[PDB]
Amino acid sequence: NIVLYYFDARGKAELIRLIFAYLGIEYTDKRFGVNGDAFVEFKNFKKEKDTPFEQVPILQIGDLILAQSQAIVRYLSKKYNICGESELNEFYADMIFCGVQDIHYKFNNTAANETTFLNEDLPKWSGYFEKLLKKNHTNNNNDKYYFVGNNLTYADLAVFNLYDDIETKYPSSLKNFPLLKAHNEFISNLPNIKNYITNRK
Amino acid sequence: NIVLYYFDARGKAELIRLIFAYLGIEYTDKRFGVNGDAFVEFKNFKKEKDTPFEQVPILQIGDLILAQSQAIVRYLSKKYNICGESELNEFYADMIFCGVQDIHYKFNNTAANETTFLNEDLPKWSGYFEKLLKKNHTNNNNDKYYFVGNNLTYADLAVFNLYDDIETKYPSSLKNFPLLKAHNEFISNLPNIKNYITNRK
Amino acid sequence: NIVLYYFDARGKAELIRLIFAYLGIEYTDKRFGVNGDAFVEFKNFKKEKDTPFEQVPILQIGDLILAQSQAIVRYLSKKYNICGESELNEFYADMIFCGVQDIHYKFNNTAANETTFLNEDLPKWSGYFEKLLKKNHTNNYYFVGNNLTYADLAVFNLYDDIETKYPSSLKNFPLLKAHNEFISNLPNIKNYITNRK
Amino acid sequence: NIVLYYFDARGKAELIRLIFAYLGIEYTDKRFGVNGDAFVEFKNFKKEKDTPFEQVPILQIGDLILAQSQAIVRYLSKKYNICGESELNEFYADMIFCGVQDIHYKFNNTAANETTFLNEDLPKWSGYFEKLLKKNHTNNYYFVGNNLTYADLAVFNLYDDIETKYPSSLKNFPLLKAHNEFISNLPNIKNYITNRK
Numbered sequence: 001n002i003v004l005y006y007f008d009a010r011g012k013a014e015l016i017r018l019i020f021a022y023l024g025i026e027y028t029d030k031r032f033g034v035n036g037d038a039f040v041e042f043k044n045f046k047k048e049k050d051t052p053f054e055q056v057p058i059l060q061i062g063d064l065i066l067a068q069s070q071a072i073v074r075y076l077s078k079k080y081n082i083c084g085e086s087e088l089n090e091f092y093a094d095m096i097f098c099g100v101q102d103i104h105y106k107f108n109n110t111a112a113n114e115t116t117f118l119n120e121d122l123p124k125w126s127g128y129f130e131k132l133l134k135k136n137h138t139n140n141n142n143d144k145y146y147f148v149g150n151n152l153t154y155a156d157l158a159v160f161n162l163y164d165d166i167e168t169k170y171p172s173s174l175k176n177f178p179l180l181k182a183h184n185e186f187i188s189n190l191p192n193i194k195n196y197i198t199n200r201k
Numbered sequence: 202n203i204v205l206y207y208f209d210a211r212g213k214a215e216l217i218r219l220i221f222a223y224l225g226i227e228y229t230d231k232r233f234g235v236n237g238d239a240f241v242e243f244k245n246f247k248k249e250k251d252t253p254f255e256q257v258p259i260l261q262i263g264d265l266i267l268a269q270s271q272a273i274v275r276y277l278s279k280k281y282n283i284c285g286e287s288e289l290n291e292f293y294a295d296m297i298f299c300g301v302q303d304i305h306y307k308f309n310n311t312a313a314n315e316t317t318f319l320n321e322d323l324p325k326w327s328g329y330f331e332k333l334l335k336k337n338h339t340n341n342n343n344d345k346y347y348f349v350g351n352n353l354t355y356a357d358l359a360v361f362n363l364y365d366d367i368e369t370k371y372p373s374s375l376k377n378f379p380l381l382k383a384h385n386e387f388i389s390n391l392p393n394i395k396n397y398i399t400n401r402k
Numbered sequence: 403n404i405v406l407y408y409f410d411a412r413g414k415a416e417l418i419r420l421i422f423a424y425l426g427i428e429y430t431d432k433r434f435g436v437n438g439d440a441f442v443e444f445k446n447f448k449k450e451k452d453t454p455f456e457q458v459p460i461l462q463i464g465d466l467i468l469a470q471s472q473a474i475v476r477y478l479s480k481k482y483n484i485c486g487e488s489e490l491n492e493f494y495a496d497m498i499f500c501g502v503q504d505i506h507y508k509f510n511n512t513a514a515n516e517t518t519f520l521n522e523d524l525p526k527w528s529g530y531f532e533k534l535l536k537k538n539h540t541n542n543y544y545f546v547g548n549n550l551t552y553a554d555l556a557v558f559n560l561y562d563d564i565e566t567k568y569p570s571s572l573k574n575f576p577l578l579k580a581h582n583e584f585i586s587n588l589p590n591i592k593n594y595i596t597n598r599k
Numbered sequence: 600n601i602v603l604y605y606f607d608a609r610g611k612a613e614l615i616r617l618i619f620a621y622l623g624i625e626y627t628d629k630r631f632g633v634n635g636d637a638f639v640e641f642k643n644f645k646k647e648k649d650t651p652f653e654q655v656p657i658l659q660i661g662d663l664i665l666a667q668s669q670a671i672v673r674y675l676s677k678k679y680n681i682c683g684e685s686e687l688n689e690f691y692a693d694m695i696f697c698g699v700q701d702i703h704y705k706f707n708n709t710a711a712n713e714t715t716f717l718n719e720d721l722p723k724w725s726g727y728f729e730k731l732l733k734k735n736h737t738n739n740y741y742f743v744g745n746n747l748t749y750a751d752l753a754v755f756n757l758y759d760d761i762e763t764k765y766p767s768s769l770k771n772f773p774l775l776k777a778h779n780e781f782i783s784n785l786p787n788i789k790n791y792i793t794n795r796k
């Protein structure tokens with residue numbers, strides 16, 4: 001019953017694919033442009049499906065059409081208990097995801113200006129996450145890194161996906177941030193996540 | 202106990218100011234640069250307050266420091282019952298807010314390219330909201346326009362603030378969208394919102 | 403007879419108005435939305451005037467329509483001898499103006515009081531122009547050769563634009579501040595600036 | 600002896616490589632990160648070579664360092680007579696290249712298969728260049744005068760870049776498609792293209 005529609009790219013779909021992998025949820029991963037014309041296939045999709053904003057990702061669960069990648073993430077995270085276990089932890093997971101969006105946007109919008117990115121913004125943002133993880137030190141041992149409380153949240157997956165994307169371009173980016181480094185390794189090594197990354201294009 | 206910190210601008214704070222107005226919540230509206238050097242005042246702020254990402258808005262409630270405008274909105278909307286009354290309506294309010302962010306971003310990032318904005322993106326996005334409101338037609342009379350369910354949500358305020366900002370620059374923007382037009386008028390005329398807009402710089 | 407058409411703003415028209423000031427050329431400064439707005443006026447403009455890209459600035463000289471601010475700037479500079487007096491200096495003038503468009507764009511899109519702009523981009527680009535000025539002498543203050551180029555008026559416009567938002571931006575850049583002062587006091591530009599709104 | 604330094608990409612180097620092809624000038628095409636990467640190499644470059652803005656492309660001729668792609672393009676075009684043979688044609692060539700940078704930027708930042716780009720910007724700008732071509736004759740295919748300018752090679756580069764992502768972009772623009780074909784078949788460019796990766 002579940003179909004995720006996106007272009008043939010990680011981008012705005014990949015966090016949702018990571019959540020379904022973590023959760024072991026079966027779905028069809030529909031990708032426009034894998035073979036044919038992405039724009040033609042997308043245009044033909046918009047004809048057949050009622051989308052609210054003529055954008056993807058779209059997640060269809062039975063007859064229910066959901067749009068807006070962040071809103072899908074939040075909905076799924078709430079339904080499947082990866083959103084934090086207190087009103088404050090839920091807020092913190094959301095705050096951290098929102099910060100991931102700021103720096104992921106900068107990464108995505110270059111990086112033609114890469115020295116400023118490489119020397120100023122990326123280190124600075126990395127330090128912000130390093131400090132957030134330090135604050136949660138505190139639930140551990142064991143091991144257990146999480147951004148928020150004592151259990152995985154979508155904020156863990158989002159920060160993983162951010163630095164997974166960054167490391168593809170800039171391999172040494174986590175050398176100066178050992179907590180953030182340990183976090184990324186911890187997440188990448190979760191059975192369902194490791195499995196998914198192995199299978200992935 | 203509540204202080205909102207931002208620059209002397211509407212921008213990323215204004216939806217939070219609209220929510221506190223709607224809710225009748227007392228707070229201090231702290232604005233950097235009202236008199237002095239905004240950057241100096243902001244730099245001095247970051248020295249005195251522990252911010253997660255060295256950005257504003259920051260909302261301080263007692264000793265609790267909250268960052269990330271969307272996350273603050275969502276937290277406040279949940280605590281004060283303006284987030285929708287079903288798991289699906291909560292998702293829809295979030296989806297609509299996320300769409301508002303897409304078009305508000307386009308508006309904010311010009312609009313040096315204004316004919317494409319004016320003739321393509323803005324009408325198209327306006328039509329998306331017009332259609333969402335049509336879908337909710339349906340809870341009414343009475344009157345009651347809402348995007349989501351039978352009661353106000355932050356999505357109503359966000360869409361109001363989006364078109365309030367747009368109308369300042371482009372007064373006739375809602376002429377072809379009468380539902381969206383009726384919605385904006387309905388929100389602007391809510392006692393606490395009308396009051397706030399009257400008082401506003 | 404010469405008409406410059408733009409919106410009511412400095413923007414992509416300002417350097418052209420500065421060259422007209424410097425050279426003491428008389429022209430009509432048509433600004434949309436006085437008047438106003440804007441808009442509408444601009445949509446009427448496009449129906450009346452045959453622009454190549456439906457953009458402004460437009461510089462009309464008699465019947466002749468010129469578009470593209472940087473092309474307009476180059477054309478005026480070559481005609482009125484503020485483009486360098488060697489092939490190499492004409493290139494350096496050009497190169498320098500292309501550098502200006504680089505940080506000017508960052509300044510225009512760095513909103514607002516972005517720390518990275520103030521602590522990384524702005525200091526770095528300021529260092530570039532300081533270094534370029536240093537290379538051509540502590541004054542012989544000219545970026546290129548030993549007379550004014552449109553590159554001087556471009557760097558002046560840049561830091562003037564910046565300064566309005568970030569006072570004391572030229573503090574750690576002695577040749578650059580001195581260049582900025584030199585240019586602002588040339589009588590024609592001094593006058594243009596006092597009378598500008 | 601001539602070395603063009605850039606990253607391993609078309610980007611802001613491509614039009615320069617196209618002019619070198621067209622004029623049959625021999626040069627070394629140094630691309631960072633073959634090799635590789637990237638990076639590192641580029642940080643080493645900047646320590647070794649005295650660049651004015653710590654950016655590439657850099658074109659070195661003997662000892663002489665040239666930066667800023669558009670300044671490099673103009674300088675080559677003026678030296679090798681592909682910049683127009685009148686003051687007005689030199690301006691139109693320039694104006695047209697400035698128009699190219701406008702939609703090229705939109706194409707480069709419109710990610711990806713943006714509908715507004717395909718239904719609004721691209722058709723509109725294509726209309727502009729069609730109109731410009733029409734104005735200069737159905738071939739006399741040249742944007743400016745009656746010989747090749749760097750403006751022809753700029754419009755060729757643009758639509759070539761586009762075409763790789765959006766096949767059939769030139770369908771409703773007969774002079775523009777014919778111009779694109781004319782240019783792609785000039786022997787020097789035909790050859791450059793087959794051998795390009």
Ligand SMILES: N[C@@H](CCC(=O)N[C@@H](CSSC[C@H](NC(=O)CC[C@H](N)C(=O)O)C(=O)NCC(=O)O)C(=O)NCC(=O)O)C(=O)O
Nearest residue numbers: 007008009010011012055056057068069070710711713714
């Ligand atoms: N990280 C990815 C790349 C980024 C990416 O996903 N790019 C997209 C386009 S933007 S993704 C497409 C875009 N969607 C949105 O922008 C959705 C915005 C909303 N706020 C949300 O988060 O859901 C959209 O639908 N726009 C349609 C329109 O505007 O007409 C793509 O098509 N890549 C494939 C390729 O190039 O082959 C990767 O490295 O693989």
Ligand SMILES: N[C@@H](CCC(=O)N[C@@H](CSSC[C@H](NC(=O)CC[C@H](N)C(=O)O)C(=O)NCC(=O)O)C(=O)NCC(=O)O)C(=O)O
Nearest residue numbers: 208209210211212213256257258269270271513514516517
């Ligand atoms: N709509 C507003 C204008 C937009 C605006 O708010 N601009 C801000 C700057 S961006 S707002 C300042 C920015 N914050 C953010 O970008 C927060 C991003 C996060 N994703 C969130 O949503 O909270 C920030 O803190 N950055 C600091 C840094 O980067 O160093 C401003 O300073 N205006 C006042 C003026 O010009 O006088 C208006 O019309 O009045």
Ligand SMILES: N[C@@H](CCC(=O)N[C@@H](CSSC[C@H](NC(=O)CC[C@H](N)C(=O)O)C(=O)NCC(=O)O)C(=O)NCC(=O)O)C(=O)O
Nearest residue numbers: 313314315316409410411412413414457458459470471472
């Ligand atoms: N930085 C300036 C502001 C920038 C500015 O000039 N803003 C313009 C918008 S872009 S200026 C208008 C724009 N032109 C261009 O973008 C010209 C680009 C070309 N490549 C060139 O360089 O000439 C244009 O014609 N648009 C095409 C379209 O609308 O379809 C404006 O209207 N300002 C007043 C206001 O806010 O009301 C300042 O300090 O005031």
Ligand SMILES: N[C@@H](CCC(=O)N[C@@H](CSSC[C@H](NC(=O)CC[C@H](N)C(=O)O)C(=O)NCC(=O)O)C(=O)NCC(=O)O)C(=O)O
Nearest residue numbers: 112113114115606607608609610611654655656667668669
């Ligand atoms: N559209 C192209 C890609 C664009 C491109 O060339 N990308 C570059 C980045 S910008 S090219 C590198 C950039 N130069 C510039 O931005 C030069 C701007 C100047 N105004 C001019 O025009 O010359 C620069 O030097 N940067 C300054 C810094 O890093 O600090 C690159 O490295 N690509 C390969 C890759 O992805 O690895 C394509 O089709 O391949």
